[PDB]
């Protein structure tokens, strides 16, 4: 006879080395791109 | 007298640390910090200096192991059963696993004290020690 009534109801970081690899690999693609575009 | 009394009943008060290092040592350790709590309050880098007798200028000590501080732990079983070159790395590796064990012992209720963390923690130490002693594979010319 008891009623069990019902209940009633971001960002991520990155380190210094990670910054380095992202920046290096980002600058390398662009630079090599300008190299082949010059050739 | 106190220290000898602790070694008898210690398997009750600190079952993990006596499982890793052994009771004759753990009794000396707990005996030093004067409890399980006060010993688990201790950072792991301060644990290796306990058995160290004293430092004096004329002692003339540089070990082949590279150990700067020889404590009650450096005489344990899990260290000196391995070759000499591995000792310096095992202290730092064992000391931590001792501390955590103590930090389990402070949290275990007095009525029921339980292991099975120290089993994994011997597995990691012994295996990782074999690995530290395993030496590189050969390289192609």
């Amino acid at each position: 006879v008891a009623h069990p009534l019902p209940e009633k109801i971001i960002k991520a970081y990155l380190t210094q080395h990670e910054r380095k690899r992202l920046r290096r690999n980002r600058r390398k693609m662009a630079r090599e791109a300008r190299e082949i575009k010059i050739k | 007298d106190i220290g000898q009394y602790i070694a008898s009943k210690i398997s009750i008060i600190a079952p993990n640390v006596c499982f890793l290092v052994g009771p004759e040592i753990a009794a000396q350790l707990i005996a030093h910090a004067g409890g399980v709590l006060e010993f688990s309050r201790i950072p792991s880098c301060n644990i290796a200096s306990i058995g160290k007798n004293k430092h004096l200028s004329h002692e003339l000590h540089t070990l082949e192991s590279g150990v700067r501080q020889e404590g009650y732990l450096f005489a344990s079983d899990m260290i000196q059963k391995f070759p000499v070159s591995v000792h310096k790395q095992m202290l730092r590796m064992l000391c931590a696993k001792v501390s955590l064990a103590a930090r389990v012992d402070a949290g275990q209720k007095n009525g029921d004290r339980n292991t099975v963390l120290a089993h994994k923690w011997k597995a990691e130490l012994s295996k990782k020690a074999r690995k530290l002693s395993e030496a590189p594979s050969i390289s192609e010319t």
Binding site: - | S57, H58, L60, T62, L63, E64
Partner: protein, 48 residues
Amino acid sequence: FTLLNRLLRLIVDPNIADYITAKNNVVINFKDMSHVNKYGLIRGLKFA
């Protein structure tokens, strides 16, 4: 050395005697081989 640190503390203030005593342990390496020098003197040192 246990005799040297004393004989040196006779002739010299202790800080220099301790330096001279501990400076001779070091570790000795030739390629593969390595040994700590407990006993003999290393005469390759300027003060030797």
